[PDB]
Structure 1
Amino acid sequence: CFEADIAIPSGISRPDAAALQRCEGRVVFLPTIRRQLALADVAHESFVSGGVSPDTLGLLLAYRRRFPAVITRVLPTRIVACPVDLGLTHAGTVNLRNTSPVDLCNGDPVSLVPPVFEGQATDVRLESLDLTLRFPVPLPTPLAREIVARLVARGIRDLNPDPDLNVLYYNGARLSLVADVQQLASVNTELRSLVLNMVYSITEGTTLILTLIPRLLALGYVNALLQMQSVTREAAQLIHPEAPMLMRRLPLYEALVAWLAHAGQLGDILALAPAVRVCTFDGAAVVQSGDMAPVIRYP
Structure 2
Amino acid sequence: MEVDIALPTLSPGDLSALQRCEGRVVFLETLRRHATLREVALPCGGDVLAAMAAYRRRFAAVITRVTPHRMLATPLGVGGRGQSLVLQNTGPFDLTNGDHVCLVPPLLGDECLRLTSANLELRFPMTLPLAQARELTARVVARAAETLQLPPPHRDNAEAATRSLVLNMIFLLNEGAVILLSLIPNLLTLGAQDGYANAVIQLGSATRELGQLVRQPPPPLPQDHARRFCVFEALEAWIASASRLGDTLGTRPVARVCIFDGPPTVPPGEKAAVVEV
Matched, 1:38 2:36: yes
More helix by share: 1
CA distance in 2, matches of 1:17, 1:67: 26
- The offset of 1:272, in angstroms, is 1.6
Runs (5+) with no aligned partner, structure 1? 48-52, 161-178, 214-221, 241-264
2:95 corresponds to 1:131 = no
Amino acid in the other structure paired with 2:20: R
Residue identity opposite 2:47 in structure 1: D
Aligned to 2:130: 141
Change (3 A) 1:267 1:15: same
Bigger Rg, which one: 2
Contact 1:70 1:96 in 2 (8 A): no
> Does the residue aligned with 1:293 lie in a helix, a strand or coil?
strand
Aligned counterparts of 2:274 and 2:178: Cα–Cα separation in 1: 49
- Separation in structure 1 between the aligned mates of residue 254 and residue 165 of structure 2, nearest angstrom: 28
Residue 28 of structure 1 aligns to a residue whose secondary structure is: strand
1:85-143 residue CA offsets vs partner (Å, 9 max, x unmatched): 145313332233343111101211111112xx2x3221211110111111011111111
Structure 2 counterpart of 1:21, one-letter code: Q
Indicate whether 1:275 and 2:244 are aligned: no
Tell me which amino acid in the other structure corresponds to 2:40. Answer: V
Q: Quick one: which amino acid aligns to residue 197 of structure 1?
A: A
SS of the equivalent of 1:149 reads helix
Gap regions ≥5 residues in structure 2: 185-206, 215-243
Of 120, 140, 148, the match for 2:109: 120
Q: Does the residue aligned with 1:229 lie in a helix, a strand or coil?
A: helix
Deviation string 1:270-294 (CA, Å, 9 cap, x unpaired) is: 1420111110011121110100111
Change (3 A) 1:275 1:283: same
C-alpha separation in 2, matches of 1:276 and 1:69 = 12
Residue-by-residue CA offset, 1:66-88 (whole Å, 9 max, x unaligned): 22111111122211111211453
Please give the alpha-carbon distance, in whole angstroms, between the structure 1 residues aligned to 2:164 and 2:60: 28
Query: 1:22 corresponds to which residue?
Result: 20
Paired amino acid for 1:136: P
**Contact 1:103–1:140 (CA<8 Å) still a contact in 2?**
yes
Aligned residue among 39, 60, 70 for 1:78: 70
The total of aligned residue pairs comes to 224
Q: Show the counterpart of 1:165.
A: none
TM-score (norm 1): 0.64
Could you tell me how far 1:203 is from its partner in structure 2?
Answer: 5.7
Structure 1: distance between partners of 2:84 and 2:167: 44
Letter in 2 for 1:62: A
SS in 2 for 1:6: strand
Contact 1:28/1:42, CA 8 A, preserved across alignment:
yes
Structure 1 match to 2:181: 230
TM-score (norm 2): 0.69
Q: Is the 8 A contact 2:141 2:162 kept in 1?
A: no
Answering whether residue 268 of structure 2 is matched by residue 289 of structure 1, we say yes
**1:269 shift after superposition:** 4.2
Identity across aligned pairs (percent)? Answer: 38
1:19 Cα offset (Å) = 2.2
In 2, Cα distance between equivalents of 1:284 and 1:8: 36
Q: In the aligned structure 2, how far is the partner of 1:59 from the partner of 1:25?
A: 21
- Asked if 2 retains the 8 angstrom alpha-carbon contact of 1:98 and 1:292, the reply is no
Decide whether aligned partners of structure 1 residues 106 and 37 sit closer, same or farther in structure 2, where only a CA change above 3 A counts.
same
Amino acid at match of 1:282: D
2: CA distance between counterparts of 1:94 and 1:75? 18
SS in structure 1 opposite 2:131?
helix
**Structure 1 pair 280/38, CA: closer, same or farther in 2 (3 Å)?**
same
Q: How far apart in 2 are the matches of 1:205 and 1:275? A: 23
- Native 8 Å contact 2:84 2:275 kept in 1: yes
Per the alignment, residue 188 of structure 1 pairs with 152
Q: CA distance change for structure 1 residues 267 and 194 in 2, over 3 Å: closer, same or farther?
A: farther
